[PDB]
Design an enzyme around this catalytic site. Structure first.
Site, PDB file in Angstrom:
ATOM      1  N   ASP A 109     -11.365 -45.909 -28.645  1.00  0.00           N
ATOM      2  CA  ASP A 109     -10.881 -46.765 -29.722  1.00  0.00           C
ATOM      3  C   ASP A 109      -9.411 -46.506 -30.021  1.00  0.00           C
ATOM      4  O   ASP A 109      -8.678 -47.432 -30.392  1.00  0.00           O
ATOM      5  CB  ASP A 109     -11.729 -46.558 -30.974  1.00  0.00           C
ATOM      6  CG  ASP A 109     -13.197 -46.824 -30.727  1.00  0.00           C
ATOM      7  OD1 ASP A 109     -13.806 -46.082 -29.931  1.00  0.00           O
ATOM      8  OD2 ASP A 109     -13.743 -47.773 -31.327  1.00  0.00           O
ATOM      9  N   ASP A 162      -6.372 -41.368 -32.209  1.00  0.00           N
ATOM     10  CA  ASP A 162      -7.392 -40.434 -31.763  1.00  0.00           C
ATOM     11  C   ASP A 162      -7.460 -40.411 -30.236  1.00  0.00           C
ATOM     12  O   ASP A 162      -6.869 -41.245 -29.544  1.00  0.00           O
ATOM     13  CB  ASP A 162      -8.750 -40.801 -32.360  1.00  0.00           C
ATOM     14  CG  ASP A 162      -8.748 -40.763 -33.874  1.00  0.00           C
ATOM     15  OD1 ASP A 162      -7.719 -40.366 -34.457  1.00  0.00           O
ATOM     16  OD2 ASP A 162      -9.774 -41.133 -34.482  1.00  0.00           O
ATOM     17  N   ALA A 210     -17.642  -1.067   0.424  1.00  0.00           N
ATOM     18  CA  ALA A 210     -18.578  -1.845  -0.383  1.00  0.00           C
ATOM     19  C   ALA A 210     -18.077  -3.270  -0.592  1.00  0.00           C
ATOM     20  O   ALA A 210     -17.021  -3.648  -0.075  1.00  0.00           O
ATOM     21  CB  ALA A 210     -18.838  -1.164  -1.729  1.00  0.00           C
ATOM     22  N   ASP A 259       6.444   6.765   4.576  1.00  0.00           N
ATOM     23  CA  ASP A 259       6.688   7.226   3.215  1.00  0.00           C
ATOM     24  C   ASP A 259       6.787   8.746   3.172  1.00  0.00           C
ATOM     25  O   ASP A 259       6.784   9.401   4.218  1.00  0.00           O
ATOM     26  CB  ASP A 259       5.586   6.737   2.275  1.00  0.00           C
ATOM     27  CG  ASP A 259       4.203   7.140   2.738  1.00  0.00           C
ATOM     28  OD1 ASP A 259       4.080   7.674   3.860  1.00  0.00           O
ATOM     29  OD2 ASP A 259       3.235   6.923   1.981  1.00  0.00           O
ATOM     30  N   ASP A 291     -10.159 -40.741 -28.289  1.00  0.00           N
ATOM     31  CA  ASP A 291     -11.250 -41.488 -27.683  1.00  0.00           C
ATOM     32  C   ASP A 291     -10.769 -42.884 -27.282  1.00  0.00           C
ATOM     33  O   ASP A 291      -9.574 -43.191 -27.322  1.00  0.00           O
ATOM     34  CB  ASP A 291     -12.445 -41.533 -28.632  1.00  0.00           C
ATOM     35  CG  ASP A 291     -12.080 -42.061 -30.001  1.00  0.00           C
ATOM     36  OD1 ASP A 291     -10.885 -42.020 -30.355  1.00  0.00           O
ATOM     37  OD2 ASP A 291     -12.989 -42.515 -30.726  1.00  0.00           O
ATOM     38  N   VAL A 316      -5.991  -2.733   4.623  1.00  0.00           N
ATOM     39  CA  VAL A 316      -5.481  -2.376   5.945  1.00  0.00           C
ATOM     40  C   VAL A 316      -6.486  -2.671   7.052  1.00  0.00           C
ATOM     41  O   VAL A 316      -6.103  -2.703   8.234  1.00  0.00           O
ATOM     42  CB  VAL A 316      -5.070  -0.889   5.955  1.00  0.00           C
ATOM     43  CG1 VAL A 316      -6.301   0.005   5.954  1.00  0.00           C
ATOM     44  CG2 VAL A 316      -4.159  -0.574   7.134  1.00  0.00           C
ATOM     45  N   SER A 317      -7.756  -2.904   6.710  1.00  0.00           N
ATOM     46  CA  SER A 317      -8.763  -3.192   7.725  1.00  0.00           C
ATOM     47  C   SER A 317      -8.453  -4.489   8.463  1.00  0.00           C
ATOM     48  O   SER A 317      -8.614  -4.569   9.686  1.00  0.00           O
ATOM     49  CB  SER A 317     -10.148  -3.260   7.084  1.00  0.00           C
ATOM     50  OG  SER A 317     -11.140  -3.550   8.052  1.00  0.00           O
ATOM     51  N   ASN A 348       0.827  -1.204   0.000  1.00  0.00           N
ATOM     52  CA  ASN A 348       0.000   0.000   0.000  1.00  0.00           C
ATOM     53  C   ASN A 348       0.863   1.256   0.000  1.00  0.00           C
ATOM     54  O   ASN A 348       0.599   2.204  -0.752  1.00  0.00           O
ATOM     55  CB  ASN A 348      -0.937  -0.006   1.206  1.00  0.00           C
ATOM     56  CG  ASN A 348      -1.819   1.223   1.262  1.00  0.00           C
ATOM     57  OD1 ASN A 348      -2.151   1.811   0.232  1.00  0.00           O
ATOM     58  ND2 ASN A 348      -2.203   1.621   2.469  1.00  0.00           N
ATOM     59  N   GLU A 352      -4.383 -43.525 -37.835  1.00  0.00           N
ATOM     60  CA  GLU A 352      -5.432 -44.527 -37.996  1.00  0.00           C
ATOM     61  C   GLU A 352      -5.910 -44.634 -39.441  1.00  0.00           C
ATOM     62  O   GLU A 352      -6.120 -45.743 -39.945  1.00  0.00           O
ATOM     63  CB  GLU A 352      -6.608 -44.211 -37.072  1.00  0.00           C
ATOM     64  CG  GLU A 352      -6.291 -44.345 -35.593  1.00  0.00           C
ATOM     65  CD  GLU A 352      -7.526 -44.229 -34.723  1.00  0.00           C
ATOM     66  OE1 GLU A 352      -8.645 -44.209 -35.277  1.00  0.00           O
ATOM     67  OE2 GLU A 352      -7.380 -44.160 -33.485  1.00  0.00           O
TER      68      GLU A 352
HETATM   69 MG    MG Z   1     -12.734 -42.045 -34.190  1.00  0.00          MG
END
Ligand code: MG
Lengths: 782, 98, 146, 240, 98, 49
Positions: A478, A474, A92, A65, A476, A96-97, A38, A400
């Site tokens: 398979d 791929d 709000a 400072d 997935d 520093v609180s 700060n 593939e």
């Molecule tokens: Mg496929």
């Protein structure tokens, strides 16, 4: 004023959720760092820009400072000075609180307009209004606080090095600011004031080492709302050290502001070496790793609205920083190299030495013959061969089908990369015969492409034409099946290739998510869940009552993670107990083992539980309770009875359930969850505001809010991706991740292959039932 | 296309940047290779493709005792480096060809 | 691995669950419709004051916020509302400070909004009788579902 | 980083377990409540959404296949059409679920015509499997892209599993169930509702055995009792 | 017209090609589907049209002779300039047929 | 139909449109919007002519 009391009490009730740990000695320094941040933000406009930090003998810290003082005006709608509003009010929804609340005594002195002001706080409660004590002729602000001894235990004394490192880094990053650190217990002083900036940072790091060239590369520009600063130098070691920062916040895992740096360095060095003819004179080719040896660099950026992977920073995911760094680096590094020839010669000599040192760690590889326009060499017609003739610098990719094959061919590097398509699922050689395997077509094509022979009679493992074989299917299931089939073939037919380490596995992504101008790639479902959680919590603050500072991000993330783990554990055990009953035990008082042989407490506990269950029912169920008496240990086991869909069921809670780990985890979560949110609690994310009454409601609201404008794209195969995406995600050697296959134990591997890929069904079914159906109900909860 | 001459050795090569409309590059390369194989065009030693993300690039190398321009003219005359396009504008007007 | 009895029992259990869920859904919908119909029927007994209040309002939001300001006398709908026994037709999410308290009706925001969307052709008595018919049918359906 | 070592056993085990679990749970085995594989349920739901009812005009198969592939099923289009064809053959199902127009094969071995020729619509009995679907009687889940909703199970009034049977091949296990007759199953369900303690012998008084669409003769009475009592058995079918 | 009716605009998400082909075949074009897909593919290649009318996602072939992927992989949507060809279509500017 | 002499004659569809008028249209603010649209319609008609 009563609201301030509520806020301070809320802060003091659970200090660990606002400042950090309170026994290791982290928040004790975090408070000082927050005050210093700060002060340094405020004092940036001072005449001399000087900050003084002092450690007194009575265990107190003061920060001073020399900028403009805090305004001393009176708010018309509040009737109090602005300083008290800053030090007390929450400002709000959404630092520093907290320090004022967690300190047993704080003294504030503000001097401006030729006057001196002073006020004293005790546990966050002011003792008198701000008063004038004398007349001065300067400006500034001082804050001195005594840390409370009721919250900070164990380590309660400040250190000197921890502050020194951070203050030195802040002085390095903020050029033109003087910071003094004085001590009084023993007596020590320091003065950090550097106008060079990052250049002094590089000089400090590369001090105990031996630099090899005098000059240091450095630049500082700004393209559009983004600032970039870079400085680097070479030493004579064999290590790499790069430090990245974003708004004076370090990242330990890099991000988007490091890949551009690396790529630009590689491109510039390779282009210069190729143009000057140094590579041609030698017989080696450099790579990215050789360039980054004995290198020290610092990268810093300034971005208005950064985006990170989690709430602990450590990684930047903003998508518009990479190009900004890379373009400037590419433009300026060539100019640097052109002006200074001696440093260029030294650096290229070192890189050539490293590259030649790498080359001497290979084996004897005779040259091969590559398929070309003027010679086919009896190779398959689906192969797209490369141009490199040395097998030790060549790669082969397996895909593939034809769509993926074309997509990969359109985005490869023709110099040292080859593509070989396949056709669907391949034969399983574990269940087949040798003649059947020979009669196949895809296997024959693969054997011809490899060029090593088959049958273990003419099979010579020294005839391999590519020293890197990469499997890329791929994303997935398979693809996993095909990968298993290929691994089975390679292990059963060509063990030496696997033993030497010529097999690799690629990792293409499965999902792509875009929101606004942000883009990212997701590998699997776990990353998807992590991304959802990360984007849900961005810019969200929670207030436990009407006037209370928001909780820290890390604590909220930890709570969310623990809650998700508990919910998953509850979902995994729905087959034995109703889920509504399990979800209610979190907010009920813990039933100890001692409170089981006494009676008259179990009755009230179960009565309260059943009343709460009946209060919130919305599906037509009815809940009743009973108490069971045991004549052996004189215990009292609760009994819960429910009626759903006209069916009566009984669920007893015995002694084993109480002492189990699942109830222990539920109680552990409840201890943190119980009594957290007060009546007037509200949540907000950005600008939207929404009052809430429960943690689940707020979490669901955040999840629903985070999904607006989100787009998800799924790749069925590699033929759905554009060639540039596939290149930059999987095929670029600079930004790819791969795995190398090794063998730990031969006997276990052989047994596993026989069990999984063999002809017998019963062992495979037993293995699947044991590993999948069972071993999923993990009752550890630790 | 154009011809580039080495500064030191004096060897010259032919570089192709663009190809005519509706022409397949692979078939063109195969046709050139077939012509070279049957010894119908003389003065070619090497042939390869180096197209990348930057753009199209086809490299043809000549022998020691050949002239690049003559080979380029022969390639123009015999291969698909030059093609003919016949314009024939026919369209339906009021439901009638014209 | 199952036999015949397990399959039959599973089918029966599935049927039970489906019927229960359908009944709950229908009950909720009927209660909401009855709640709307009550407010629609009340407004037809105070046409002139409501018209004057709407005309004097400068903005529809002002008319909406002024509609829920004072209780409205039941008038001729007291006998109709007396037939509703206890909270049979009362939605489960309704707070106790709304509805009929003492010879007077207290509207809510949703009911006030429903009034502002009333056609001018609803002032005919045929619609007034249709409201009563629908209310009685809804009460019978609620009784059967309960 | 770029290169990371890994043991072959862990990779093999993980990949094979993932594939096996996916195949077992989501491709080949039917549910016990409605007797439908996921593809059948998705096809039926897609046909229901389009409003392709039993008393309206036919629609081309290509449109339905395209909708199913583009919105719910992320697989090939040939398998979907092959699945649709089987649900309209009188010699394959005891109670057909799809009404078809055109050439749908024959018992003599002829193949069905291409999907650019045929037309389909829902059967009358198929509406009983999706009754009260809009009254929150079942749960819904997301599709692969997270842009649609798919029912988790149908709220059927028909015990489809017993009356139509099932057949599939999976990893480590398989299923095979014969069809039955509707009236006998209804009588058995009524008897169970009346008693809820009836034995196997009592139930067999209403359900003597299976019933095939192609008639023929079942030779022998053993095997039926063993299958109904344990779950496995063998029977013999003889031509007339 | 089918793509316009589907609401597949230039600033929205892509759609599967099979869905569009099915709609076209089932409602307007009484012919085969492979020819329709091939026609759709050509309108998206930058080396075939001076101004493309369809925006594509995936592998749509190359100038080296590579074939496009199957219609179960790719996704398409309308191009920006294509909206200028169908402007003011709902204000009775042209005739309609069955 | 229409204005003849200080009087207005309605049609069947105009009468039907009156019966479908919401009660909120009697608000003061809602009345002034029609006069704003009338001028714009007249200007558009003039431009089209
Ligand atoms: Mg496929």
């Amino acid at each position: 004023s009563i609201k301030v009391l509520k806020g301070l009490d809320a802060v003091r009730k659970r200090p660990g959720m606002y400042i950090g740990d309170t026994d290791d000695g982290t928040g004790l320094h975090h408070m000082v760092f927050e005050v210093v941040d700060n002060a340094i933000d405020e004092a940036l406009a001072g005449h001399c820009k000087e900050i003084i930090v002092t450690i007194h003998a009575d265990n107190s810290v003061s920060v001073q400072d020399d900028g403009r003082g805090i305004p001393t005006g009176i708010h018309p709608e509040e009737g109090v000075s602005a300083a008290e509003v800053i030090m007390t009010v929450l400002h709000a929804g959404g630092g520093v609180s907290v320090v004022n609340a967690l300190s047993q005594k704080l003294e504030l002195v503000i001097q401006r307009e030729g006057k001196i002001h002073r006020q004293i706080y005790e546990h966050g409660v002011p003792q008198a209004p701000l008063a004038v004590t004398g007349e001065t002729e300067k400006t500034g602000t001082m804050v001195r606080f005594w840390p409370s001894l009721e919250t900070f235990t164990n380590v309660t004394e400040f250190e000197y090095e921890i502050l020194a490192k951070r203050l030195r880094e802040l002085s390095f990053l903020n050029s033109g600011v003087s910071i003094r650190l004085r001590d009084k217990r023993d007596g020590k002083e320091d003065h950090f004031h550097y106008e060079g900036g990052i250049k002094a940072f590089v000089e400090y790091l590369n001090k105990n080492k031996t630099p090899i060239h005098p000059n240091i590369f450095y630049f500082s520009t700004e393209k559009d709302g983004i600032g970039v600063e870079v400085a680097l130098q070479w030493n004579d070691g064999f290590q790499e050290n790069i430090y990245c920062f974003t708004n004076n916040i370090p990242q330990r895992d890099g991000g988007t502001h490091l890949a551009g740096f690396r790529a630009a360095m590689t491109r510039t060095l390779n282009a210069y070496m190729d143009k000057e003819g140094y590579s041609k004179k030698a017989k080696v080719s450099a790579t990215g790793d050789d360039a980054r040896e004995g290198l020290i660099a610092v990268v810093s950026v300034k971005v208005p609205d950064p985006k990170f992977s989690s709430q602990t920073k450590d990684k930047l995911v903003s998508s518009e920083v990479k190009s900004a760094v890379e373009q400037q680096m590419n433009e300026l590094l060539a100019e640097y190299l052109l002006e200074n020839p001696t440093d260029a010669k030294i650096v290229v000599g070192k890189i050539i030495d490293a590259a030649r040192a790498r080359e001497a760690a290979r084996r004897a590889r005779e040259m091969t013959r590559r398929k070309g326009a003027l010679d086919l060499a009896g190779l398959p017609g689906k192969l797209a061969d490369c141009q490199e003739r040395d097998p030790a610098l060549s790669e082969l990719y397996l895909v593939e089908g034809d769509s993926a094959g074309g997509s990969a061919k359109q985005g490869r590097n023709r110099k040292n990369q080859a593509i070989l398509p396949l056709k669907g699922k391949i034969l399983n050689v574990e269940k087949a015969r040798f003649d059947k395997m020979l009669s196949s077509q895809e296997v024959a094509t693969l054997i011809t492409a490899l060029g090593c022979g088959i049958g273990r009679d003419e099979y010579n493992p020294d005839k391999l034409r590519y020293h890197s074989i990469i499997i890329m299917t791929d994303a997935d299931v398979d693809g996993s099946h095909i990968r298993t089939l290929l691994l089975t073939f390679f292990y059963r037919q060509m063990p030496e290739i696997v033993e030497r380490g010529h097999v690799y596995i690629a990792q293409p992504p499965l999902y792509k998510v875009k929101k606004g101008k942000q883009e990212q790639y997701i590998k699997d479902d776990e990353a998807m869940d992590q991304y959802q959680i990360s984007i849900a919590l961005d810019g969200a603050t929670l207030h436990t009552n009407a006037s209370a500072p928001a909780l820290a991000g890390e604590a909220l993330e930890k709570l969310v993670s623990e809650y998700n783990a508990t919910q998953k554990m509850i979902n995994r055990m729905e087959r034995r107990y109703p889920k509504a009953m399990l979800k209610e035990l979190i907010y009920q008082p813990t039933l100890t083992e001692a409170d089981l042989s006494d009676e008259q407490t179990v009755t009230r506990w179960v009565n309260a539980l059943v009343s709460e269950l009946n209060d919130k029912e919305q599906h037509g169920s009815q809940w009743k309770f009973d108490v069971h008496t045991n004549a052996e240990q004189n215990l009292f086991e609760p009994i819960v009875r429910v009626r759903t869909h006209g069916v009566d069921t009984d669920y007893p809670l015995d002694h084993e359930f109480i002492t189990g780990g699942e109830y222990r985890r539920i109680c552990t979560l409840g201890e943190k969850l119980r009594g957290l949110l007060e009546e007037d609690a509200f949540i907000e994310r950005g600008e939207r505001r929404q009052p809430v009454a429960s943690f689940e409601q707020a979490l669901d609201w955040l999840v629903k809010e985070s999904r607006r404008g989100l787009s998800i794209q799924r790749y069925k195969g590699l033929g759905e991706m554009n060639p540039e995406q596939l290149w930059e995600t999987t095929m670029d050697p600079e930004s790819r991740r791969m795995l190398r296959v090794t063998v730990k134990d031969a006997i276990a591997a052989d047994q596993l292959f026989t069990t999984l890929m063999g002809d017998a069904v019963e062992p495979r079914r037993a293995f699947i039932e044991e590993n999948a159906l069972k071993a999923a109900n993990i009752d550890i909860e630790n | 296309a154009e011809v580039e001459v080495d500064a030191k050795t004096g060897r010259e090569t032919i570089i192709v940047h663009e190809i005519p409309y509706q022409v397949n590059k692979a078939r063109l390369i195969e046709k050139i290779a077939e012509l070279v194989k049957e010894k119908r065009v003389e003065g070619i030693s090497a042939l390869r493709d180096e197209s990348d993300k930057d753009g199209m690039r086809i490299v043809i190398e000549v022998k020691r005792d050949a002239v690049g321009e003559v080979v380029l003219n022969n390639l123009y005359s015999q291969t698909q480096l030059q093609v003919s396009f016949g314009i024939n504008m026919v369209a339906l007007h009021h439901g009638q060809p014209k | 691995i199952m036999n015949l009895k397990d399959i039959i029992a599973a089918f029966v259990r599935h049927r039970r669950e489906v019927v229960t869920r359908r009944t709950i859904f229908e009950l909720r919908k009927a209660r909401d419709r009855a709640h709307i119909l009550e407010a629609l029927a009340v407004a037809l007994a105070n046409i002139d004051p409501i018209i004057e209040l709407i005309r004097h309002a400068p903005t529809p939001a002002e008319a909406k916020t002024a509609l829920v300001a004072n209780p409205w006398q039941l008038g001729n709908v007291a006998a109709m509302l007396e037939r509703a026994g206890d909270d049979a037709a009362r939605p489960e999410w309704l707070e106790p400070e709304f509805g009929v308290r003492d010879g007077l009706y207290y509207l809510t925001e949703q009911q006030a909004q429903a009034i502002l969307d009333l056609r001018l052709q609803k002032l005919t008595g045929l619609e007034h009788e249709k409201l009563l018919d629908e209310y009685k049918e809804l009460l019978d359906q609620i009784a059967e579902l309960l | 980083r770029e290169i990371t070592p890994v043991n072959i056993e862990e990779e093999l085990k993980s990949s094979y377990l993932d594939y096996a679990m996916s195949v077992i749970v989501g491709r080949a085995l039917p549910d016990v409540r409605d007797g439908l594989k996921p593809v059948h349920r998705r096809v039926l739901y897609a046909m229901n959404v389009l409003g392709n009812d039993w008393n309206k005009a036919y629609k081309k198969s290509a449109r339905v296949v395209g909708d199913v592939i583009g919105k719910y099923h992320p697989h090939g289009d040939s398998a979907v059409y092959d699945t649709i064809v089987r649900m309209a053959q009188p010699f394959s199902l005891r109670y057909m679920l799809v009404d078809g127009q055109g050439n749908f094969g024959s018992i003599d071995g002829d193949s069905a015509a291409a999907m650019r020729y045929t037309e389909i619509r829902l059967a009358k009995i198929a509406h009983e499997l999706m009754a009260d679907l809009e009254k929150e009687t079942v749960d819904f889940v997301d599709n692969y892209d997270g842009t649609e909703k798919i029912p988790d199970v149908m709220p059927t009034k028909i015990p489809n599993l017993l009356v139509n049977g099932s057949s599939g091949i999976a990893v480590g296990m398989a299923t095979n169930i014969p069809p039955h007759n509707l009236t006998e199953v209804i009588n058995g369900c009524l008897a169970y509702i009346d008693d809820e303690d009836i034995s196997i012998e009592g139930l067999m008084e209403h359900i003597p055995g299976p019933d095939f669409p192609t008639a023929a003769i079942i030779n022998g009475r053993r095997g039926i009792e063993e299958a109904y009592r344990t779950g496995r058995g063998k029977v013999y079918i003889r031509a007339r």
